[PDB]
């Protein structure tokens, strides 16, 4: 915020980026999610066979 | 086969299917290979978390 002018909202998020930068952990399981790109692609192979 | 006439490949061929159709049992196990199309996009998806 400078003396007399306005506060972008291009500087106000990111400054919330570095605010949740910082909600993740500094050393973190990288848990996999699966993915639905992956996911379907063996639903559809067991489907495929008939599961 | 007629009788002055020859015989083309594309009987010879659908013969050979005759025969290689009976090569298959009446019934089966639906035993799945993983085709490429799915064991890379589950290979891949360990890659990009890193194993």
């Known amino acids: 915020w400078k ?3 306005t ?3 291009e500087n ?3 400054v ?3 605010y949740a ?3 993740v952990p500094k050393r973190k399981l990288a ?3 699966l993915p639905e ?3 379907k692609a063996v ?3 067991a489907a495929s066979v008939g599961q």
Do not use: Q, R, Y
């Open 7 to 9: 506060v972008s909202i």
């Open 43 to 45: 639903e559809d192979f």
């Open 21 to 23: 930068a910082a909600l």
């Open 16 to 18: 919330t980026d570095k």
């Open 12 to 14: 106000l998020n990111t």
């Open 37 to 39: 790109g992956v996911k």
């Open 3 to 5: 003396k007399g002018k």
């Open 31 to 33: 848990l996999p999610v």
